[PDB]
Amino acid sequence: STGSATTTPIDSLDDAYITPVQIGTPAQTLNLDFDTGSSDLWVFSSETTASEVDGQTIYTPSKSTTAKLLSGATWSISYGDGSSSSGDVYTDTVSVGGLTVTGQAVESAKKVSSSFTEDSTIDGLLGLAFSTLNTVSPTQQKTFFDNAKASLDSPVFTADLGYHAPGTYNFGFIDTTAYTGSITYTAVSTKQGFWEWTSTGYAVGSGTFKSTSIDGIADTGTTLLYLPATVVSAYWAQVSGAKSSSSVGGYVFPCSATLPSFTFGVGSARIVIPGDYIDFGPISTGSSSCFGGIQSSAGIGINIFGDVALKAAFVVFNGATTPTLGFASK
The missing domain is CATH 2.40.70.10 (Acid Proteases)
Structure with a gap:
């Protein structure tokens, strides 16, 4: 079925x-x-x-x-x-x-x-x-x-x-018509009950790819992308006027900004999140401060590939005896 x-x-x-x-x-x-x-x-x-x-x-x-x-x-x-x-x-x-x-x-x-x-x-x-x-x-x-x-x-x-x-x-x-290119599969750990995997690194905008292991979960029920503070700081440093606001609860940026893309690694493959996907709009109606879609995981205890990341991909949740995740561009 x-x-x-x-x-x-x-x-x-x-x-x-x-x-x-x-x-x-x-x-x-x-x-x-x-x-x-x-x-x-x-x-x-x-x-x-x-x-x-x-x-x-x-x-x-x-x-x-x-x-x-x-x-x-x-x-x-x-x-x-x-x-x-x-x-x-x-x-x-x-x-x-x-x-x-x-x-x-x-x-x-x-x-x-x-x-x-x-x-x-x-x-x-x-x-x-x-x-x-x-x-x-x-x-x-x-x-x-x-x-x-x-x-x-x-x-x-x-x-x-x-x-x-x-x-x-x-x-x-x-559905092989729903994505472009090939699906790259990657290992899953079920030890915490999640679809937990390890990304192979990231890039900010047109910058060079940084190879580094980032363990996190594929979570359709989380809106944003939560990553280590080092990674998130590197992203927002490329947006003039962006800053982390403790009062607002994360990184905010001028609504007049154009955001860079963010790339994450899946094995040797790369998924590109367009900059527009990272804009979550004014912090309150009429404000010119906008809320960022990439935020630090430092206060969570786990990195979370939420909807911001997942919606840039076609994602396979393979529940075979040895589970795996697959990502394709689309």
């Missing part, structure tokens, strides 16, 4: 992408944030504290003839940005882009933190990291991809995120 679903930016900055997901019978379609940095499929629901729902579409398990309470199971997750959610668990039929999994754990939120409430466009998350990170207790549950894997034509999914435009998540096949 295969599936193919369009993913759409939630706003004009590409802060996140939502993908429609069918849950239950008859289908309830929710728009979920596919997140290769986490491993829970959780949704706003009829159980979510009413004051914490503000415009999201909810899953109502009592209206699904295939829903079953997973008795005794609870979940609670905290994300790198300080947001969180928790609740109980149903199993139900879940379909993405025509690919159906029966008995998928659908984690129903009883509580969500304010950042989720405040984002009316995201009805929940669909985790695509390794199932070892799933938070359901006392019986850990499998991700949608892990449940689907055995049925797929090939044990892979691909992320093809758009710049200020829709893109595509495919399951079970690699």
Whole structure:
């Protein structure tokens, strides 16, 4: 089997992408944030504290003839940005882009933190990291991809995120028309539960490529590119007037600037992020200070190849027995 679903930016900055997901019978379609940095499929629901729902579409398990309470199971997750959610668990039929999994754990939120409430466009998350990170207790549950894997034509999914435009998540096949050149594959460590890999270096603009190993994760659920402070300083040094602002929370730059590209290495291959992808717009409406899309990871503990990086590539998440990542230009 295969599936193919369009993913759409939630706003004009590409802060996140939502993908429609069918849950239950008859289908309830929710728009979920596919997140290769986490491993829970959780949704706003009829159980979510009413004051914490503000415009999201909810899953109502009592209206699904295939829903079953997973008795005794609870979940609670905290994300790198300080947001969180928790609740109980149903199993139900879940379909993405025509690919159906029966008995998928659908984690129903009883509580969500304010950042989720405040984002009316995201009805929940669909985790695509390794199932070892799933938070359901006392019986850990499998991700949608892990449940689907055995049925797929090939044990892979691909992320093809758009710049200020829709893109595509495919399951079970690699669309050879969706990229240029060849796909370069690279080894993955699953030791932390992430799609963790090592980039071979970087370049700023037309500058020389610096060969250096940068371990990080491929994370579709993170907006920006978070890299070591040395790398990030070298990038922003090429933008007149750019500076790191502790009060704003990162590097800012004059909105009048033209940003240089940023290149990262995948083996001997190179993925070029155009400068425009690094512009996240005014820090507040009407400001002439703009927020940068490349930021330091120093306060995180891990480097993160988020959407800024991934949307410059066609990305293969190969979930074979020995997982690998593939990157192609597009």
